[PDB]
Structure 1
């Protein structure tokens, strides 16, 4: 029931969406005290594991990938930390570099498809998920794909992943995840919710799955459950800035504004820890309650505790 990718025209646009912006190169940092610490990669790994700050782990991996631009695992971990630090362009850049060095990495493919979905490049995400499938289960996928004007790319790949999920004697996750992502892009969020809630019962000690549940809910206007899943993710990992940002966005959505300004101050303070990304949202939350004393003090070179009072932590 499929004609091609791009679906008889009418998907040409939405294929140009994933191309017009191009590729940005990774933007390194200027004050990175690890510039020559020969254990910088080891320090980065230990920061990632010991629940340290994510900005510092990111700096350590900056150093490790500026010391040997072939350490695939260094690029992979730099992308992993940068996307959970709420820096999608740096994350996408690092993961792209890793995949270009190691064209058969699995976790790179997965995290990159999720970031593409976040940026709205749904078709690039479809190709990446297809590629992850055929490099993870090559024979099953190869004979799935050989079975050969109604269906578009999303439905085709959803059916392929469904059939792949049925042709194996387990329910091993990271396939339910991709099913959730496909449904998510289709905008039928309840199938996504079922998939993520099922992938959590098999391992409810995750943070990314709780944050993906929060996002899937908050897209469906269930802001209370969204807040709760974000709080859960943060309970499992206090360094997770992605979840704080989502929490603040939905708080703003539901009239909670002092907490949201506190959360954005906390995010701008978790990014600014070396001794940043969108500030506009802070301006919007201040314009919502309309406090000029803090409205007019917008600055990427200012203090955060200076924002005492209701904005204060």
Structure 2
């Protein structure tokens, strides 16, 4: 396997870890759900729903690398699972895999029977995607996933204003969708509008209190605005909820900038408790 399964996974022993993973997702316990889904992928690697759920969870748990590995299994097993193509496009965009991101969006659109009929990293592939999505928008004008998909595409080319407009329309249409609010927030954040981003993230966290990616993104935006007390608080939540070293290193920089050398030294132990108390 290309997937680095956690050793000593207690769900390996369980009757029905798939059910348990789904229930963990409903509860929003992402780390636990991922482990449960991992157990299913180990025991039954042909189970496409298992890889998809794993991939989906890992990306929300701020692990795009692990997400991609899992989603590619899902994509092999069911090339018409559009949730898999959608998530691959998102994680590849985050990872700046331009070609792979455009391949996923295109597959996302064309895998739907409904739809089946400059940018330096991948110029023509980009134009094609843009054209296909706009043509689809002509066939189905108020489709929130089409607007969201144009948001992903426009993030890829750093056209954060067009991305934000499309994604704002998507959340107007689906205001209880946690992923859409996070996507809008990330867009706004990357487009140097972190205050607005934080409002979107707050909506996302209210829907899914276990959305570790949103928590991380909030640490990022607060750090960008140099509100380090607020960044530190969100980052502690993120680290605690995630379970990593990259986040601890980011946390270390916050503690340094705020002139807390006593706390910086404590980050190597990687115990979140003194920091949970502190913040």
TM-score, normalised to structure 1's length? 0.82
Do residues 297 (structure 1) and 266 (structure 2) align? yes
Q: Shift of the alpha carbon at 1:242?
A: 0.4
Give 2:193's aligned residue: 222
CA deviation string 1:164-199 (max 9, x = no partner): 221x25522211111111122222211111111111
Q: Shift of the alpha carbon at 1:118?
A: 0.4
What is the aligned counterpart of 2:250 among 263, 278, 281?
281
Mark the CA change 1:152 to 1:52 in structure 2 (over 3 Å): closer, same or farther. Answer: closer
Structure 2 distance, partners of 1:134, 1:223, is: 34
Q: Shift of the alpha carbon at 1:82?
A: 0.7
CA contact (8 A) 2:28 2:209 kept: no
Give 2:78's aligned residue: 102
CA deviation string 1:52-71 (max 9, x = no partner): 41111111111111111111
Structure 1 distance, partners of 2:223, 2:56, is: 27
Structure 1 distance, partners of 2:276, 2:146, is: 46
- Structure 2: gaps of 5 or more residues: 118-122
Structure 2 distance, partners of 1:118, 1:249, is: 14
What is the aligned counterpart of 2:124 among 142, 149, 152?
152
Structure 1 residue ranges (4+ consecutive) displaced by more than 4 angstroms after TM superposition: none
CA deviation string 1:126-179 (max 9, x = no partner): 1111122222147x544xxxxxxxx6332332122212221x255222111111
CA contact (8 A) 2:28 2:211 kept: no
Mark the CA change 1:194 to 1:308 in structure 2 (over 3 Å): closer, same or farther. Answer: closer
Give 1:29's aligned residue: 6
CA contact (8 A) 1:87 1:277 kept: no
Give 1:43's aligned residue: 20
What is the aligned counterpart of 2:47 among 59, 71, 90?
71
1:201-220 to structure 2, matched below 5 A, reads 201-220=172-191
Mark the CA change 1:307 to 1:164 in structure 2 (over 3 Å): closer, same or farther. Answer: closer
Q: CA RMSD in A?
A: 1.8
Mark the CA change 1:52 to 1:308 in structure 2 (over 3 Å): closer, same or farther. Answer: closer
- Larger Rg over CA atoms: 1
Mark the CA change 1:101 to 1:277 in structure 2 (over 3 Å): closer, same or farther. Answer: farther
Structure 1 distance, partners of 2:245, 2:241, is: 11
1:111-126 to structure 2, matched below 5 A, reads 111-126=87-102
Secondary structure at the aligned position of 2:46 is classed as: coil
> Structure with the greater relative contact order (CA < 8 A, sep ≥ 6): 1 or 2?
1
TM-score, normalised to structure 2's length? 0.92
Give 1:9's aligned residue: none
Count matched residues.
Answer: 273
Structure 2 distance, partners of 1:169, 1:32, is: 45
Do residues 136 (structure 1) and 112 (structure 2) align? yes
Which has the larger share of helix?
Answer: 2
CA contact (8 A) 1:287 1:295 kept: yes
